[PDB]
Structures are given as C-alpha cells and as structure tokens.
Amino acid sequence: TRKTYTLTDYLKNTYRLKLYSLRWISDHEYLYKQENNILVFNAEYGNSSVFLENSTFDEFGHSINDYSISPDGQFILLEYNYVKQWRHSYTASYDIYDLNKRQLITEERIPNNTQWVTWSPVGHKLAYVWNNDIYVKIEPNLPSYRITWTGKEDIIYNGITDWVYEEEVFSAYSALWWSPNGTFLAYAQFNDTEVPLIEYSFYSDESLQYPKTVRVPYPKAGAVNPTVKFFVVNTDSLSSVTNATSIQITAPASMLIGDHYLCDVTWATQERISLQWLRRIQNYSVMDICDYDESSGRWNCLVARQHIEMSTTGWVGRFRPSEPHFTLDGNSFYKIISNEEGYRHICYFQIDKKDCTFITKGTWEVIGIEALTSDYLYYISNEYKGMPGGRNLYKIQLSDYTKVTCLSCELNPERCQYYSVSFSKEAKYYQLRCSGPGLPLYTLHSSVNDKGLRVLEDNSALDKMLQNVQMPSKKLDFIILNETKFWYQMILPPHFDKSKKYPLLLDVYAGPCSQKADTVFRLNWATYLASTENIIVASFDGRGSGYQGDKIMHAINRRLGTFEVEDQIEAARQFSKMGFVDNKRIAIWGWSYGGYVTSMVLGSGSGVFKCGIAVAPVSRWEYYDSVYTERYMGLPTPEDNLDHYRNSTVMSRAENFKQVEYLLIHGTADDNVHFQQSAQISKALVDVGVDFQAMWYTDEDHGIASSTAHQHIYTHMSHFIKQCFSLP
Amino acid sequence: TRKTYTLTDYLKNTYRLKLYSLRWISDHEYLYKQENNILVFNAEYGNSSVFLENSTFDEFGHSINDYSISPDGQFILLEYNYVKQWRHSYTASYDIYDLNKRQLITEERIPNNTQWVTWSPVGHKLAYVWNNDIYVKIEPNLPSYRITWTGKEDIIYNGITDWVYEEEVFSAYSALWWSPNGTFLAYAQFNDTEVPLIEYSFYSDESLQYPKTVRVPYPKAGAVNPTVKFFVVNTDSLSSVTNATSIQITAPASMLIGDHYLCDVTWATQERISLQWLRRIQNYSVMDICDYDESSGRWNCLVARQHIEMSTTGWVGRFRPSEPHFTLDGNSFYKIISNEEGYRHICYFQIDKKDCTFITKGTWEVIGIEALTSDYLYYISNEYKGMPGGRNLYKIQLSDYTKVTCLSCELNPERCQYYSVSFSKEAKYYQLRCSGPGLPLYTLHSSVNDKGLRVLEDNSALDKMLQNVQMPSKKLDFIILNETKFWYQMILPPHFDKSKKYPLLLDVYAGPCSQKADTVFRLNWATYLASTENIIVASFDGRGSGYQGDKIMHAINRRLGTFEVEDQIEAARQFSKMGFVDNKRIAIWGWSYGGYVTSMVLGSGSGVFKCGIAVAPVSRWEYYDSVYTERYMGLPTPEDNLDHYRNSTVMSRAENFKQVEYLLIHGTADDNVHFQQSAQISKALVDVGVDFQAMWYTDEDHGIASSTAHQHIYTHMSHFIKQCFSLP
Ligand SMILES: *[C@@H]1O[C@H](CO)[C@@H](O[C@@H]2O[C@H](CO)[C@@H](O)[C@H](O)[C@H]2NC(C)=O)[C@H](O)[C@H]1NC(C)=O
Ligand SMILES: *[C@@H]1O[C@H](CO)[C@@H](O[C@@H]2O[C@H](CO)[C@@H](O)[C@H](O)[C@H]2NC(C)=O)[C@H](O)[C@H]1NC(C)=O
Ligand SMILES: *[C@@H]1O[C@H](CO)[C@@H](O[C@@H]2O[C@H](CO)[C@@H](O)[C@H](O)[C@H]2NC(C)=O)[C@H](O)[C@H]1NC(C)=O
Ligand SMILES: *[C@@H]1O[C@H](CO)[C@@H](O[C@@H]2O[C@H](CO)[C@@H](O)[C@H](O)[C@H]2NC(C)=O)[C@H](O)[C@H]1NC(C)=O
Ligand SMILES: *[C@@H]1O[C@H](CO)[C@@H](O[C@@H]2O[C@H](CO)[C@@H](O)[C@H](O)[C@H]2NC(C)=O)[C@H](O)[C@H]1NC(C)=O
Ligand SMILES: *[C@@H]1O[C@H](CO)[C@@H](O[C@@H]2O[C@H](CO)[C@@H](O)[C@H](O)[C@H]2NC(C)=O)[C@H](O)[C@H]1NC(C)=O
Ligand SMILES: *[C@@H]1O[C@H](CO)[C@@H](O[C@H]2O[C@H](CO)[C@@H](O)[C@H](O)[C@H]2NC(C)=O)[C@H](O)[C@H]1NC(C)=O
Ligand SMILES: *[C@@H]1O[C@H](CO)[C@@H](O[C@H]2O[C@H](CO)[C@@H](O)[C@H](O)[C@H]2NC(C)=O)[C@H](O)[C@H]1NC(C)=O
Ligand SMILES: *[C@H]1O[C@H](CO)[C@@H](O[C@@H]2O[C@H](CO)[C@@H](O)[C@H](O)[C@H]2NC(C)=O)[C@H](O)[C@H]1NC(C)=O
Ligand SMILES: NC(=O)c1cccc(-c2ccc([C@H](N)Cc3cc(F)ccc3F)cc2)c1
Ligand SMILES: NC(=O)c1cccc(-c2ccc([C@H](N)Cc3cc(F)ccc3F)cc2)c1
Ligand SMILES: *[C@@H]1O[C@H](CO)[C@@H](O)[C@H](O)[C@H]1NC(C)=O
Ligand SMILES: *[C@@H]1O[C@H](CO)[C@@H](O)[C@H](O)[C@H]1NC(C)=O
Ligand SMILES: *[C@@H]1O[C@H](CO)[C@@H](O)[C@H](O)[C@H]1NC(C)=O
Ligand SMILES: *[C@@H]1O[C@H](CO)[C@@H](O)[C@H](O)[C@H]1NC(C)=O
Ligand SMILES: *[C@@H]1O[C@H](CO)[C@@H](O)[C@H](O)[C@H]1NC(C)=O
Ligand SMILES: *[C@@H]1O[C@H](CO)[C@@H](O)[C@H](O)[C@H]1NC(C)=O
Ligand code: NA
C-alpha cells in the first residue's frame, strides 16, 4: 500500500516542485542559476556559458541575498545584509562589481541601510533611497548627487512608499520611475505628518530586557491619510548644475478639491509621462498625459489628453485603475477597463480623444496585457472553455482585430490550463509557465513563428516521486444559483467513493475580486488533509469574487460581511446535498479576509458548521486601513456608511459562538491586521461567556511564515481539526 | 444523594462566608456597618446606637465606594468615582459631610482625581495628594496649604509611592505619615527620572480605533532605580502667605555610598521618628532614630541611636526589615528579627544601646507584634503544637519573660487553629478572628482578665447550608526530607476511599517565605475539583518557604528556580508512591511565582507530571522588578550573579516540554509580570517544535479578576484538567 501525503511531507517539503526562473537580459539571452553558478543562455539554440562562476564571491565575506546586472551588462549589483520590513519593503547593503575589470568597487559605496536601489533602464546609472531621500550615481564609482533634502523617518518619504501605499496601491516599496532611456527620474513624495500611528510591542530575542514599541504611520478607516506630490528631475543635468531642480506635476483640479491618491505612473516616451489619480471615494479616477516643454523646462498636461474612468456600480479597477500600454510613438495606448456589460476588456485609446474602442469582448475577462509590438498585442484571459479559473495567452493582430490566436490553449489541454508568460526584451521569445492542473511545465517559444523551441523543466523528477504516493484528486465545477454559475473546487481523498460520507473542510478567503476555485496544482495543507486524513477540502467563489464580471464582483459594494459570507454558508448546504458529505462534520477555516469570513460564518447561527479556525482575522472594518477598506465600504460616518461598518463586526455575533468550536490565532507583530482585531474578538467572547481555543504567535506578522512558526501553526490546526472530526 | 460543590457554586459565590469587619474608634467603642447604616457599639456590653443613617445620602447622586470618619467623629469623608490603578493605588473623588451640623461641605473641597487622602490620627486635619503633590487642610471647610510643588506625573512622587515601592516595599500607595497627635506630617519623595518605562498596549472598548500604549516607570533587575528623599513638615505653623518649609532627614552615610531604599517609617513619640534604610544589596539595613530640636527647628538623628540589622545567609526581614514597636516614652522598642538560630523572635531594644535582648525563643516564629502595654506585649505566633501553618495570639509579661500565656489556643481547638486579632485603642479589648480549619468565628474579648465577652459572628447560616453539600476534607501533615520535616496539605474528595486511586493536582506558589500548607478554611477552585471531580488537590511547602526559620527560608538565596522547584517534584514523587494516588494522572498548576515554578517543573524532564497550567508566570528573572528580584538574586552582572539569572529561565527548558501537556495563560495588560514573560516562553516552545495550549486575556492584569475573565479562565482551566485526567 503506497504511502500518503502526510503533514511532515508538507512541513518538511519532501516533495519539491521545480520551477525555472530566468532573467531576460536582452532580446535573445537570459540568465539562469544552476548549481550556484550564473549561466547565460541563448534562447534561439539553448546553448550557454558561465556568466559568473559561483566561486566569484567565496571570499566576499557575506552571504549574497540577490543580484542585479545593469542593463548594459557592465556591472552587477550585489545585495546582502537583507532585512525584511513589510510585504514588499526591506533594507540591505549593496556592493557593485565591475564585470569587465572583474573587480569589486570600494569607492563611493552605496550606504548601508539603503531602502531601495534600481539601475536606469539603459546603461548603468543608479538611483537609490537612503534615509528617505533620493540619490543618483551616474557612474558606479563616482559620488552620488542628492535629489531630495526633505526625507524624515515616518514623516516624509521620497521615492519610497509609506505603509498603506506599499500594501494597497503600488504593491511595491519603490516610488520612483526612470524614463525609457534614463534621462529623467520621476518620483512620488508621501507626507504622513498627521497620519495616526499603530503601536504594538515587539519582544525580540530573550536577551532584550524591555520590549520595544513599534510605531507605524497607518491610517485606519476614516482617519487622516498621507498626502502625495509628484516630481520629475532631469538626471542628465546633474553634473552641470550644483542642485538640479525637481519639477512638480500637480494633480488635476478634480482631485485637488478633496482627499486623493496617486495610483499609477507610466512613461509613454522619452518626453511624455502618464499619471493616474484616484479620489478618496474610489469610483472616480483621472489620467493626465504630460509632455516635457523644452523651452520652459516644465511638464504640461493638456486637458484634451486627460482621461476619466469612473464606476457607477463599484470602485474603479480590480484593486486600482489598470495601467496603460503605449504604442512606440506614445500617441495611443491600450488599457483594460470594464465594458458596458461589466466585463474587463482591452480598450484602444488615441491620447487626445476621449472615446476608446474595445478590441476584445465577451462574457469572460482579460487578466493582463503582457507585451505590445508594432503588429501584435499579447494578453492573458480566462476565455478558454468559459472557465473563469483558467488562464491562457492570446495574440491579437493590431491591423485586424478579428484575428485572435490562442498561443497556449492546445499545447497540452489536459495538463495545462493556467499559464503566465515571460517575454524577452523586444518580445522575440517568450517563456510559458503552466502551473496546473497537472505538474507545472516551463517551455520556451519563438515569437516569429510561435513554435516551441524546447521544454525547460517538466518536473519529471517530482512526477516519479509522486507515483508511489496516494495523492488526492481535484474537482473544479460549478453550481447554479439564481440563474448564475458559481464555481467551486474540491480536493478529494484518494479512492474517493461517492457512496461514503466524508467530513468536509471549507477553505475560505472570499475577499473582493478573490478567486479560490482554479486550475492550479498545489501541494499544501489541504493535500495532507485529503490524502492522509480523508477529509474533503472545498472552496467556493460566490458574490464579490473576481474575473467573472462586475455584476458578481460589485455585488458586495458598500456591504462587506454580507453576501460573500452568506454564499459560503449556502455553498456548504449545496455540498451536503451532494450526498457524500457527513452533515455532522462540516468545518470552515480562513486566513486574513478569510479569517473574517470564517468568523462571520461561525457567528451567524446557521447551525451548518461544527467548528472553525480564523487566522489573523479582520474583526471590525474601522480597524483596517483606509485605502483597502474605503474602496469597498465608503467612509465610516453617519452621512456615508457608518451603520454598515457597525453592523458588520465579528464582535456583535459573539453570543452565537456558543454553538460552535472556535480556534482563534494571531501573530503579535502583525502590522497589517493588528493583533488588536483578535484582541477585541476574544474580549467579546469572554464577555458573553463563550469558551474557545486560542494561540498567539510571538513576533510573527500577518504571514506567520517564519520556519518554526509555520510548522507550529499547521501542527496546532491539524490537531484541532482532527479532534473536531473525531479522527484518530 | 446530596449535591456537590460545583464550578458554578464557586464562580457565582453561592456559599458566602460572613465576616465582621469593625473599626475601633476609641478604647471602648467600634463602628460596624449594618444595612448600609453605620452603628457604634460599646465593647463592654454589646449595646449599640445608630451613628449614621443609610438614607443620610439618598440624594447624594454618586455611588459611595467607601467612607472614613474623622478620629473625633465630627466628619465623614465620602469616597466615590473610584478608579483602580495598581495593586493598592487608585484615584477617586471625595466629599466631606459635617456630622454635627448634618451638612455636606461645599467650600474648598478635595479635588477630583485625588491619589490619596488621610485624616490626622487625632482631631480632623486632612492630608491629600493630588497631581503628585501634598496638600494639608486644617479644617474641612478651609482652603488647603500646598506642601510640595515638584510633583510631576511619572517622574516626581510626593507623598505617594511609584510602581516598585507600591508593590514591593510599602504594599501601599501612601507615602505619608502623621505624627501621633497630628502636629507633624512626614513624607517621602520618589524620583523616577531615569527609570526605564515598561510599555504595552491597552485595547479598551471596541469603539477605540487605535490601541493605547501604557507606559510605566518600572525598573527590571539591574536597571536604574528610583531615588528617594524623606521630609517632615510642621502642620501647626502653616501660613497662607508663605510656602511651607519641609525639613529633610538625610539617610546615613553607610547608605548614601550606593543605591538604597527607604523601607520603614514609624513614629516613636510626638517629637521622635524612626526610619529604616536598606542597601540595594538587601542584606544590610540601618535604623535611624530622630528627635525634633525646638531651637533649630531641625531633626537630628544621633549616631549613638543607630541600629544595624544584617544577614549573612540571605536578605533582611521576611520581605523587608520589620517595624519597631515603641514604648509610651519612646525610649525602647520591640522588634521581630532573626535570632542566632535563624528563627524570628521578638528582641527588646534600648534606643541608645547596641545589644538587644530576645524575649521569646524556640523552633517556631513570631508572625507579628499586635499590641503593647506597660505590662504585656501581645503577639501572634505559630508555636502551638509545633504547627508552622497554625496561628495563635499570646501575651508575654514584660517583667518576667518566662510568663507567656496563649490567649486563643484553647478557645475551640477543633474548629480554630488560625487567628488574627484587632485590639482597641489602648488594648482594653480585642476581637479574635478565627479563619480555620472550621468555619470563620469572630469573637470579642476584654484584656484585663481575658474574658470572652461574646460571639460576634459564627457563620451558623453557612454551616446550615453546607450540611446539604458533599464537601471535601483537608488533611495537613508532613513528610521528612534529610532529617527535616516539610508540611503539605491535601484537599480530599468527599467519602475519600484510601483503597481507590485518585488523580492528583499539585497547587503551587512556592515563592520565598510563602506558605501553602495551613489550617485556613477556603471555598475555592480546589473545593470544586475535589468535591465534584474527585480530584485530590495538594500543596507543599519546601525549601524557601516561610515561618520555619532561615535555614529553610534562605536555602534558595541567590538561587531561585532550584531547590523550591526540586522539592515540589520530590513531594509529587512521594505522593505518587501513596496507595490512593494514580501516578498516571498527576498534574501541577500555579499563578504568578507559582506559574514560574509550574513551568520550571514541567520543563524539568522529571516525568512525574502528565500536564500543567501556568498563569501569568515569571519566565526569566531579568524581566521582573529590581526590588523583589535582587532581594533573592543579587545583581545580574558577571561580577555578581548573572550566571544563575541565565540558568534559571523557563525558556532554556523548552525541549523538555515535549512529554507534557501545557496550558499557558496571561493577561495582556499585566503591569506586574509583563505579557513579555509568556511571549518569550511561547516563542521558545515554538522554536523547538513543542505543541501546547494558550490563552491571552485582553486588557486583564495580574489578577485576571474582572468578573467575566475570572469565570472564563476557571472554566477553561477546568476543561483542560478534566481532559488531561479523562474525566466526564
Ligand atoms: C551559443 O553558441 C553560438 C554558436 O557557437 C555562439 O555564437 C557566437 O556568436 C558570436 C557573435 O557574438 C560569433 O562571433 C562567434 O562565432 C560565436 N562563438 C564562437 C566561439 O565562435 C554563442 O556565443 C553561444 N552563446 C552562449 C551564451 O554560449
Ligand atoms: C508635510 O505636511 C505637513 C502638514 O501635515 C506640513 O507641515 C506644516 O508646514 C507648514 C509650513 O511650514 C507649517 O506652517 C505648519 O505648522 C506645519 N503643520 C504641521 C501639522 O506640521 C509640512 O510642511 C509637509 N512637509 C513637506 C516636506 O511637504
Ligand atoms: C537644493 O534645492 C532644494 C530646493 O530649492 C533645497 O531645498 C530647500 O531648502 C531650503 C533651505 O535649506 C528650504 O527652506 C526649502 O523648504 C527646501 N525645499 C525643498 C523642496 O526641499 C535644498 O536645500 C538644496 N540643496 C542645496 C545643497 O542647496
Ligand atoms: C533620451 O531622451 C532625451 C529626451 O528626448 C534626449 O535628450 C534630448 O536630446 C536632444 C538631442 O537629440 C536634445 O536636443 C535635447 O535638448 C535633449 N532633451 C533633454 C530634456 O535632455 C536624450 O538625448 C536621450 N538619451 C539618449 C542616450 O539617447
Ligand atoms: C502635639 O505634640 C507637639 C510636640 O510635642 C505639641 O507642640 C508643642 O506644644 C508646646 C505647648 O505646650 C510648645 O511649647 C512647643 O513649642 C510645641 N512644639 C511644636 C514642635 O510645635 C502639640 O501641642 C501637641 N498637640 C496636642 C493636641 O497635644
Ligand atoms: C551581602 O551579600 C553580598 C553578596 O552575596 C556579599 O558581598 C560579596 O558578594 C560577593 C559575590 O557577589 C562575594 O564574593 C563576597 O565574598 C561577598 N562579601 C563581600 C564583603 O564582598 C556581602 O558580604 C553580604 N553582606 C553581609 C553583611 O553578609
Ligand atoms: C451602651 O449602654 C450604656 C448603658 O450601660 C450607655 O450609657 C452610657 O452612655 C450614655 C450616653 O452615651 C449615658 O446616657 C449613660 O449615662 C452612660 N451610662 C454608663 C453606665 O456609662 C451607652 O451610651 C451605650 N452606648 C451605645 C453606643 O449605645
Ligand atoms: C530627580 O532626579 C534627576 C536625575 O537625577 C535630577 O536631575 C539631575 O539630573 C539631570 C539629568 O537627568 C542633570 O542635568 C541635573 O544636573 C540634575 N538636576 C536637575 C535639577 O536636573 C532632578 O533634579 C531630580 N528632581 C528632584 C525634584 O529631585
Ligand atoms: C471635579 O469634577 C467634578 C465633576 O465634574 C466637578 O464638579 C462640578 O461638576 C459640574 C458638572 O457636574 C461642573 O459644571 C462644575 O464646574 C464642577 N464644579 C463645581 C463647583 O460645580 C468638580 O468641580 C471638579 N473638582 C474641582 C476641584 O473642581
Ligand atoms: N496594487 C495592485 O494593483 C494590486 C494587484 C493585485 C492584488 C492587490 C492587493 C489585494 C489585496 C490586499 C489586501 N491588503 C489583502 C488583505 C485584506 C484584508 F482584509 C486583511 C489583510 C490583507 F493583507 C493588498 C493588495 C493589489
Ligand atoms: N511590604 C511588606 O512588608 C510585605 C509583607 C508581605 C508580603 C509582601 C509582598 C510579597 C510578594 C510580592 C511579589 N510582587 C509577588 C509576586 C512575585 C512574583 F514572582 C511575580 C509577581 C508577583 F506579584 C509583593 C509584596 C510584602
Ligand atoms: C558551484 O558551486 C556549487 C556550490 O553550491 C558546487 O556544488 C558546484 O560544483 C559549483 N559548480 C561546478 C560546475 O562545480
Ligand atoms: C556598512 O556597515 C558595516 C558595519 O559597521 C561596515 O563595516 C562597512 O564598512 C559599511 N559599509 C559601507 C559601504 O558603509
Ligand atoms: C461614487 O460613490 C459615491 C458614494 O457611493 C456616490 O455618492 C457617487 O454618486 C459615486 N459616483 C459615481 C459616478 O457613481
Ligand atoms: C438602608 O438601605 C438598605 C438597602 O440595601 C436596606 O436594606 C436597609 O434596611 C436600610 N436601612 C434601614 C435602617 O432600614
Ligand atoms: C511657592 O513656591 C512656588 C514654586 O516655587 C512659587 O511658584 C510660588 O510663587 C510660591 N509662593 C509663595 C507665596 O512664595
Ligand atoms: C540534604 O537534603 C537536601 C534537600 O532537603 C539536599 O539538597 C542535600 O543534598 C542533602 N544533603 C546535604 C548535605 O544537605
Ligand atoms: Na461570653
């Protein structure tokens, strides 16, 4: 009898998924790390050479965390002393290595504790942020030119985002953008002077006698938000003037009338930049297209080139207005926007004309635009077989929109239905990355004739190992409710028998625009639960979920904690009505937004669930950040949506928890969903006399991802689920 | 056939013990509150009169927390708007009511948020502290005189103690001392300027959007301590035109050479005050006796009147040097000190003579001196039947120390073995309070011939109720370890059958000078565990425990976390050998110092215990406060005792928790044993991969005493223990 996929296998990663992470350095070459050596591959023929011997930095004296080669291939940036901060931010030390001279540069080194660094897109200029100010080095070994003098810890951020912009707007720490050929450096400046601070203790190593109080400018719903300004500086003038001028580009009048955000920055040409602004009430955004005026050294944004994007049913964009993809001459661009039917498709815009033309349409959506050439636009969508949880690469002829070719749909339909892509510099080649439903498969292709060049990694090694394991199977299907299809997936135990009644665990996230039902292959906790514990693990995408049109996504507008919660309960009812589920053993669990939904469900009094686990749950919307919360909930004031804010808390459902078994878990150093959120849930449960299980994780953040805490939490949850389901 | 004592009985106080709290107002009468009415009783005859109508304040508007009648009976201080701070501190509002004119005083009233207030010992002067400064009122309706002007929140404390002095030295918030007739007012001033602050979050009500950060000057072991100064002001010469002059009394030179503390202030006569000072290395103390000089208006403390108290085996006193009891003329005093055998007895001192004479002796100890007349000294001791856990009242003839008479031993030996007492103003009468082993008994006596006047409260009502309940019994006995006896007690289930095997729960505290084996009657969690769950609850007093001499108490000097932990394991090992104990079901639990011992025991690898519960445990001595910790551990420096500070942590024993079930509990707003202590334990366990159970209590402090949290924690621990013992 073959072994099963156990908890230890998951926690120790015995069955390793292989991937193929390459870095395009040109239009026909990429870098790949093999046996700690950096190799350079020729896409066309597959042959290669050693770009940088693994013994190059054996006496560097430091473990190198990452590297970055300059665009011209002349230097390599070495990152070490990596210190993580939030989801994307971190600080580190950097050294620059001269490839040609094969020497490390020791003069005018990048400062320690540097917050962000980036090469110019062409050549080898560098821009970095240190102590919240921007610096530019024209040459690696020469002195830096300071660009800003206003930087101030926790107050003024130049070229880097503050906490909320990093997490909710840019999903990046950097807030600087080099123009295409490197002449200009654009950047944002955030001012958090009046933004309130979240404070929590950090205990650190046992040797620290007094706990440290961490303080972070973080605007909770309805609080004072950071303000923002945008500037552009000409780096080519740096060595000619003592102090180069940063030219400010002001937001439009329609934005200046109230609170607003800078939400996108995209260069069009060497002398034209586009910026998108979003009002604090996130259903109105404006894009300005600004040109450099060589006679005045200023940037002007013609109103005739301004584009408005608004929404009558919800917020704008999936999580923010989408980015534009400009044609080479910068006179037109393509952008994903929702059409009249509520589905996101690609629209073609002339920069000085307000009405655009949709080039794709249908009851499916475009996920992203991947590359644009003079003759073709490449994009990823879920059109294939009408499966919203699938992803394929398509090519559309710019001179004839009726000519659309799916480049990945039929490569291996049974094994591959979820693709992402990586194009070379001028799109001459592309790497396809299949991530499911079968084992991930990485392949290389030539754009000139769309022919497959070779398989890069097929995971045959893993497939061989899994042959001797009783793996679970995955079912992806839908149920019809109110004439609408809603998709779900089920991880089913080996030798599934529909004549038996299996316990069921509902794995939930369900946040706005989320998707938990897809064709991706995963080896995770659910794999062990189904394989070893014979538990069915299901997920359902109901109202509020994404990639299926606005009608579904905007159903929860201004009403978080309602339909998305109700639909998970209904999904459980539908699953029990399938005949192979033990109604007496239905559990539910979720992390983050999933923890909020899990808690709301356990406190609904539905009687459908026996037990549930919430990890780092949101508990009341006024405790979460402004940008994310307000996008879906508006403002917490009597004149706007305060009543629903107060009506959608977990605490108000405390009494109903007497009907279930609950495990509440939270990391004490969670900078995202503050420990405070679970602290209030527990106090409300204690106040009504409800017993429950709890676990805090000292110094862990929203990811509870340290190696030991990760193993500890899944082990703890495994015992809780096995006990609730009466499993040996 | 009858009911047992249930968890609900304990949590809802179904069976209440009646008390008889009286307040002596002279040598012949006392005040007693009955039906909200304050009555005055004549001690000789037992007749009473109404002193103050319960309705007198029907329209007061505020809920009165407590009351305090001036010594001359002319006024009554009304306390309301009570707001608790630490163990003893709190702030409140006050109003003074004139009893003669039956009117509430409205002129010059005591401010709101007053930190401390007290009537002078004679008459009706008042002294109060507000905003950290001292004020004095000669008449209730007249304006107050500002005595100090340096008061500053969290920095300068005049007349009130800072956190550490409140908890560890004076066991009180008050740092004011009126002279016998009220002429002088002595006070201490604490300076916490350089004391580090402990910081932690307070979540408050759900409505608070951002958690609050509490900051408290708290010196952990080895950190900078507050400094202290002492002053005396003459309240009979106060002027409303000039600021009051406070005369400072400086500490002796042997104290000023290094860090030190003020540990006792006791007035001897109208013009003589004694003060005891203690070195930061708590084995050297000095008492100064100071006399007022009418000519200079200064206070002089003659070196010839200095008395040194030191210890070569440990620290000085049980928790601090004991208080002196001066004779009427103030020329001599009686004080409890450790004799040459290491047993605490009463020594008689001449104020200007170095050698004192012990007036009691034996292998037992005097607990406290209770009253002194020219012919007799009254004291409580555990001499009777050689039981260190028993307490009786004795009197010794000052003219012949061989004449010692026990006054409570034979009153009712079967019901009463643990007494405390309350003497009238001139020791003419005394109230005896028996607290066990039977139900509490309160009686009144006359000193002239020790007549038993009457029974004040015999709890016959409770006795009648308990007759219908299957109550547990208590066994007090000893085991011998190395020729030394150590006492233990066992709460035994109803109908205890020595032929059956019972699970056993070891209830531990075990801090230095602690005593957990005694003759006190208690209705608590253990009562329920024994009565309803048939669990034997045991407690043992090992090395380090009190009231049995320094040989036992000082055994753990400079060595916390060693002998006291080992002795609990040895006791359990012995109890497990007994025929009526199921060695497969032995558990252990403790709170505070008891949580530390429980944790050190569970991490010892002894294999004796199946499970255990630690509530608000200390985990590393460097995290606890200086005054208490250093008293037993010295300083955490390599030159002193750092190695043992580092070897006595719970964290270092994490690996050994793999074979036990552990439940760790802690209140997040614990200002005494910071949450930090449990946060480091959990992280250590996560780091070695040990699973355990946890529960935090939002906003609860060291007492986890709020009504809902109290019920919740005992409910949670009860489930944990029953589950560990496989009990229905
Ligand atoms: C891959 O193999 C090709 C063919 O051998 C290499 O082609 C070289 O191309 C350069 C142009 O830059 C010509 O001057 C040479 O004739 C070719 N090399 C030699 C040694 O003759 C190519 O360099 C190889 N690429 C890698 C990364 O190894
Ligand atoms: C960041 O924003 C703050 C306001 O929140 C600005 O501070 C004000 O600056 C003006 C101009 O000197 C002063 O008169 C005010 O007293 C300041 N107000 C506050 C609340 O500090 C600040 O100038 C901005 N900083 C930058 C670099 O833009
Ligand atoms: C470079 O130019 C900037 C912009 O003029 C200077 O920044 C100003 O500095 C003055 C005085 O130090 C302040 O009053 C202004 O508020 C600053 N403006 C900004 C936008 O920061 C900067 O000091 C100059 N650096 C040097 C070396 O001259
Ligand atoms: C990058 O683009 C910039 C902007 O077009 C170029 O700078 C201009 O160069 C022209 C010469 O062709 C000059 O007449 C202008 O004065 C320059 N404008 C500015 C703002 O500098 C720049 O030459 C390009 N860089 C490279 C390497 O091609
Ligand atoms: C309380 O005791 C003080 C000190 O002995 C008394 O004050 C003294 O009173 C006499 C009058 O007989 C004066 O000669 C002294 O100068 C006073 N000394 C001081 C320091 O004031 C006071 O009278 C006593 N109070 C009561 C009510 O007996
Ligand atoms: C009070 O206790 C301290 C510490 O135990 C004693 O001081 C010295 O402590 C060090 C270790 O920290 C020893 O090496 C010394 O032998 C101790 N004695 C001296 C004089 O340094 C101190 O002796 C104790 N005081 C009394 C009166 O016993
Ligand atoms: C208790 O009883 C005595 C009587 O024995 C009361 O009487 C004493 O005090 C009265 C005023 O308080 C006087 O009117 C009596 O003359 C006096 N008698 C004696 C013998 O002392 C006494 O007041 C009563 N005390 C209380 C508190 O009610
Ligand atoms: C309380 O203690 C502080 C610190 O010991 C006293 O201030 C002293 O220390 C300062 C630095 O912290 C020095 O700059 C000063 O010279 C010294 N004195 C003063 C007045 O600052 C402080 O005075 C003390 N306060 C009181 C009322 O005693
Ligand atoms: C302390 O607070 C109390 C209650 O607020 C004060 O009492 C009065 O409160 C009323 C409202 O209830 C106010 O309008 C008055 O101003 C307060 N004072 C008086 C005299 O009525 C009280 O005054 C405060 N303590 C002090 C010393 O002012
Ligand atoms: N920047 C983008 O365009 C973009 C593109 C894809 C996804 C996202 C994205 C989506 C969700 C977030 C939320 N902070 C996730 C989240 C939700 C919550 F309730 C509690 C905690 C939490 F962490 C943050 C960023 C952003
Ligand atoms: N002031 C006195 O003379 C006196 C008399 C009797 C008892 C005490 C006394 C005894 C112990 C304390 C300790 N802070 C108790 C304690 C110990 C610990 F590890 C963790 C927390 C904690 F809370 C505080 C005061 C003091
Ligand atoms: C490069 O370094 C690695 C260390 O991880 C070593 O194992 C490998 O053999 C080296 N490369 C070659 C070609 O030997
Ligand atoms: C970075 O800091 C380290 C540690 O102090 C120091 O040794 C090194 O010289 C610094 N490097 C630079 C470039 O400043
Ligand atoms: C944007 O949202 C606000 C709040 O619901 C609403 O009042 C306003 O009309 C909306 N604007 C549009 C164009 O829908
Ligand atoms: C005073 O009020 C209490 C209310 O708790 C009442 O029981 C008592 O009878 C009242 N006093 C008198 C003398 O009636
Ligand atoms: C009393 O002392 C304080 C503080 O030094 C001062 O402000 C006040 O004016 C003084 N009052 C008199 C009457 O001297
Ligand atoms: C005596 O007994 C104690 C415990 O009571 C033990 O620690 C010690 O080693 C024994 N021997 C001596 C000489 O103290
Ligand atoms: Na009697």
Swiss-Prot record, chains A, B:
UniProt induction comment: Up-regulated by IL12/interleukin-12 on activated T-cells. IL12-activated cells expressed enhanced levels of DPP4 but not mRNAs. Down-regulated by TNF. Up-regulated in migratory endothelial cells and in the invasive endothelial cells in tumors. Induced by hypoxia.
Sugar-modified residues: 47, 54, 112, 181, 191, 243, 283, 482, 647
Domain notes: The extracellular cysteine-rich region is necessary for association with collagen, dimer formation and optimal dipeptidyl peptidase activity.
Additional remarks: Level of plasma concentrations of the soluble form (SDPP) can be managed as a colon carcinoma diagnostic and prognostic marker.
Keyword Protease set for record: yes
Annotated coiled-coil segments of the chain: none
Function: Cell surface glycoprotein receptor involved in the costimulatory signal essential for T-cell receptor (TCR)-mediated T-cell activation. Acts as a positive regulator of T-cell coactivation, by binding at least ADA, CAV1, IGF2R, and PTPRC. Its binding to CAV1 and CARD11 induces T-cell proliferation and NF-kappa-B activation in a T-cell receptor/CD3-dependent manner. Its interaction with ADA also regulates lymphocyte-epithelial cell adhesion. (Microbial infection) Acts as a receptor for human coronavirus MERS-CoV-2.
PROSITE patterns: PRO_ENDOPEP_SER
Protein name: Dipeptidyl peptidase 4
Enzyme nomenclature, EC number: 3.4.14.5
Major enzyme class: hydrolase
Effect of residue 181 to A: Does not inhibit dipeptidyl peptidase activity, interaction with ADA and homodimer formation
Subunit note: Monomer. Homodimer. Heterodimer with Seprase (FAP). Requires homodimerization for optimal dipeptidyl peptidase activity and T-cell costimulation. Found in a membrane raft complex, at least composed of BCL10, CARD11, DPP4 and IKBKB. Associates with collagen. Interacts with PTPRC; the interaction is enhanced in an interleukin-12-dependent manner in activated lymphocytes. Interacts (via extracellular domain) with ADA; does not inhibit its dipeptidyl peptidase activity. Interacts with CAV1 (via the N-terminus); the interaction is direct.
